[PDB]
């Protein structure tokens, strides 16, 4: 039951991409993918139950070593702890519904089976990454999910914008991966082994934490690395949902939680800055997908702050990930359903009424919005309040800035989420498309997401939920009031006169433009200078005419 | 200020494109079409206050000021229909252009499919 | 119309009739809207292969399982694995293979 959690999606994806798929068709490919996802999900549920509740960690010898030269020893070995069990359970539960939705959304796509196979590869490599006991397998999972994301974003190879976005994201993640590789070099040189269980550190040389955090921020799309995330909406809805729910974006935070070898000051500063930037970004746009992506970034920043707080903060951050994934995927899927009912319209300004879409999709979007904004007694409510309370008691004076920033960010989160729902349904109709699709499978996927959200409340992620921390009565009620304020302001749907601030905010602070010409055009010029001026010039040896 | 091609437009056409793009931008800054309606009425009325202008110097002044106002107000995220230029649904999956097929190439001219030297 | 076209299958009913896709391309996955005739029998055979490989990896997984500490309570892994050590509770009392308190302190 243990190795079923990893090998089964991989085998399913291999079959879906094998020449065997020629003899099956899209019907058969969908059947195979759904069956593989369900079986892996059952295995993951069993493993989660046993590990979390009965505390049984199991280590696996899989393929022997991978390579052992010198004191460096690398082995195909898998270990399942509480962290690995949580990650596997979350990823499988997300990706099962993601596959269910993708089996219906792209029904009129020509090459559906390739899409299914790449999704299965993405899920399997995520399972590989989380199953890692040593850092090399973590790297393998990192690059495998990167490759799968590259293929999935560039699925529609006929649109240049998607190709540009994929290449940009790949290069940014490769910068992060070089930083991570340098950190791995340092970790092995100063610790002599790669298994996380053999990594217990009290005070490193600083570069360890710095480089590891930079590499993690690369995957988590934090400050100075978030630009790629918005452009990823060029890909199909299932890819964005899977990436933003439980994979890729989660991997950096997962590595940080597994390691717990960071530096609190830099972690807190980066997380707070990224959260504030994501919050101000999400309320200032009109593309539906970009807002949800920026919300993903904001929750990533929340988790960063939590893990920077401490070990308890790290576990709370892991629980925040576990609760965030479900409703993030739910929001993505509901947005995709509404968009398809809107004739592919991906802009908010042409929506309205209760005629374009089904009742279940509307209710699912409502529930996901309520959970994400921290509505009292809900899934995101518990994790967000726990992180806030643990951040309202930190011993770092730096954290005081972070607490205020996160309060503002949560208020803005409620603001733009309520604006999203308001523009989706509450406003009058202002588009031209009504094709309400009421197919069983995506509705069932939404149902599974909502059931998992219910479980996350009826059953806590860890023992932290319910652990009461002693705050003044106003302090606890503060995020509730902030969400109420966001509700009021968004239901007013009002705006300001300071239009220069508006044009600045909408531009995403010009970060893409800044990176367009500070490093990039100079890289191009350095390349031309090197080649032409040196090789054909200074390094050139001409001909002796005669 | 407009672009050089728009600078070459006839006065009637220049003002027409000005008004059209202004309506486009007002949609782009609009929360909804319903919000856009009174803005559309006001924008139509404002031009109605300039219908009987004859002195070309003041006409050019008004046109240039409006062009500068519009240029200052180029929307960063325009509202586009999905299957047109710049739209998200544009250039997704086109029909395959005709491509000729070569049957059994290895079978032709065997033992002589290498490289000259 | 060329000679080899007669060996070629037509465009599938799933495919949009207004689309042309140069049907002669051998694709690794099947191509465009691929939907064979005996597809359900192929699907059943594929599921059979899936189940056989599932059984093989199930056997290997049960074979190569290493449990370094007694679990905290009853688990379903017992019913198919005997290498699983007998559980020990939070209070350190050893418990039977059924995960219940033994005699002397039970009931």
């Amino acid at each position: 039951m243990f190795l079923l959690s990893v090998f089964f999606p991989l085998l399913g994806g291999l079959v879906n991409t094998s020449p065997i798929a020629r003899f099956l068709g899209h019907r058969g490919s969908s059947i195979i993918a759904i069956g593989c996802m369900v079986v892996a999900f059952i295995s993951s549920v069993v493993i989660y139950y046993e590990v979390v509740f009965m505390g049984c960690a199991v280590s696996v010898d899989v393929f022997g070593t991978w390579f052992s030269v010198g004191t460096f020893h690398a082995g195909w070995t898998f270990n399942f702890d509480l962290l690995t069990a949580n990650m596997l359970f979350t990823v499988t539960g997300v990706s099962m519904a993601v596959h269910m939705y993708a089996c219906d959304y792209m029904r009129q796509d020509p090459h559906l089976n390739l899409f299914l196979g790449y999704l299965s590869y993405f899920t399997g490599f995520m399972c590989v990454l989380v199953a890692a006991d040593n850092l090399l397998v973590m790297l393998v999972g990192w690059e495998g999910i990167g490759v799968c994301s590259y293929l999935l974003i560039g699925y529609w190879s006929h649109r240049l914008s998607a190709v540009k976005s994929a290449q940009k994201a790949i290069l940014v993640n490769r910068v992060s991966d070089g930083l991570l590789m340098w950190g791995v070099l340092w970790v092995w040189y100063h610790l002599g082994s790669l298994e996380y269980d053999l990594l217990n550190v009290y005070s490193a040389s600083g570069f360890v934490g710095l480089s590891i955090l930079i590499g993690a921020m690369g995957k988590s799309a934090q400050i100075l690395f978030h630009v790629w995330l918005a452009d990823a909406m060029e890909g199909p809805t299932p890819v964005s949902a899977l990436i933003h729910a439980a994979t890729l974006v989660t991997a950096g935070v997962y590595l940080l939680v597994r390691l717990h070898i960071h530096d609190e000051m830099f972690v807190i500063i980066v997380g707070s800055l990224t959260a504030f930037m994501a919050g101000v970004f999400g309320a200032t746009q009109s593309d539906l997908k970009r807002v949800i992506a920026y919300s993903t970034c904001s929750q990533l920043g929340y988790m960063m702050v939590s893990l920077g707080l401490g070990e308890t903060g790290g576990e709370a951050s892991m629980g925040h990930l576990m609760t965030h994934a479900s409703f993030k995927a739910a929001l993505f899927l509901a947005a995709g359903m509404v968009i398809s009912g809107n004739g592919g319209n991906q802009h908010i300004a042409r929506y309205g009424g209760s005629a374009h879409s089904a009742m279940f999709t509307m209710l699912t979007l409502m529930v996901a919005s309520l959970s994400l904004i921290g509505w009292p007694e809900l899934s995101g409510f518990y994790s967000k309040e726990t992180i806030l309370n643990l951040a309202a008691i930190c011993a770092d004076p730096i954290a005081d800035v972070a607490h205020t920033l996160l309060l503002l960010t949560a208020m803005l989160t409620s603001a733009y989420t309520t604006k999203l729902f308001y523009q989706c349904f509450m406003v009058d109709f202002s588009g031209s498309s009504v094709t309400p699709v009421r197919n069983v499978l995506p509705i069932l996927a939404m149902a599974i997401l909502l059931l998992d959200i219910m479980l996350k409340v009826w059953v806590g992620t860890n023992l932290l939920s319910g652990m009461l921390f002693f705050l003044p009565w106003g302090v606890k009620t503060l995020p509730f009031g902030l969400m109420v304020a966001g509700i009021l302001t968004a239901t007013a749907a009002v705006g300001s006169e300071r239009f220069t601030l508006i044009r600045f905010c909408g531009s995403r602070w010009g970060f893409d433009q800044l990176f367009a010409r500070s490093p990039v055009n100079p890289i191009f010029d350095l390349g031309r200078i090197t080649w032409a001026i040196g090789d054909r010039g200074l390094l050139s040896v001409g001909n002796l005419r005669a | 200020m407009a672009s050089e091609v728009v600078l070459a437009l006839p006065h009637k056409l220049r003002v027409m494109r000005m008004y059209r793009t202004g309506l486009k931008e007002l949609i782009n800054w609009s929360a909804n079409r319903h919000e856009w309606y009174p803005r559309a009425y006001a924008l139509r009325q404002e031009f109605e206050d300039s219908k009987a202008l004859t002195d070309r110097e003041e006409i050019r002044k008004k046109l240039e000021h409006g062009e500068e106002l519009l240029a200052r107000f180029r929307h960063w995220e325009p509202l586009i229909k999905p299957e047109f230029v710049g739209g998200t649904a544009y250039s997704i999956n086109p029909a395959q252009p005709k491509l000729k097929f070569i049957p059994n190439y290895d079978a032709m001219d065997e033992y002589k499919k290498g490289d000259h030297l | 119309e060329p000679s080899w076209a007669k060996q070629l299958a037509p465009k599938s009913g799933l495919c949009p009739p207004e689309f042309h896709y140069n049907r002669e391309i051998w694709y690794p996955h099947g191509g465009f809207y691929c939907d064979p005739k005996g597809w359900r029998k192929n699907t059943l055979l594929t599921l059979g292969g899936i189940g056989v490989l599932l059984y093989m990896t199930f056997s290997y997984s049960t074979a190569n399982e290493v449990r370094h500490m007694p679990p905290k309570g009853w688990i379903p892994s017992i019913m198919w694995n005997s290498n699983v050590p007998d559980p020990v509770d939070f209070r350190g009392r050893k418990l039977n293979r059924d995960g219940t308190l033994p005699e002397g302190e039970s009931s």
């Binding site: - | 070569i102 049957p103 290895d106 | 060996q7 299958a9 009913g13 391309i25 005739k37 005996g38």
Partner: peptide, 30 residues
């Protein structure tokens, strides 16, 4: 959906593409 159901008869017989571009001739083995 063909036949109006997800469990309908198939629609494809013949050769789906030419592997390597090798085309059968008069039923003679390649």
């Amino acid at each position: 959906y063909p036949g109006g159901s997800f469990w309908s008869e198939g629609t494809q017989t013949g050769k789906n593409g030419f592997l390597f571009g090798e085309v059968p001739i008069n039923g003679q083995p390649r």
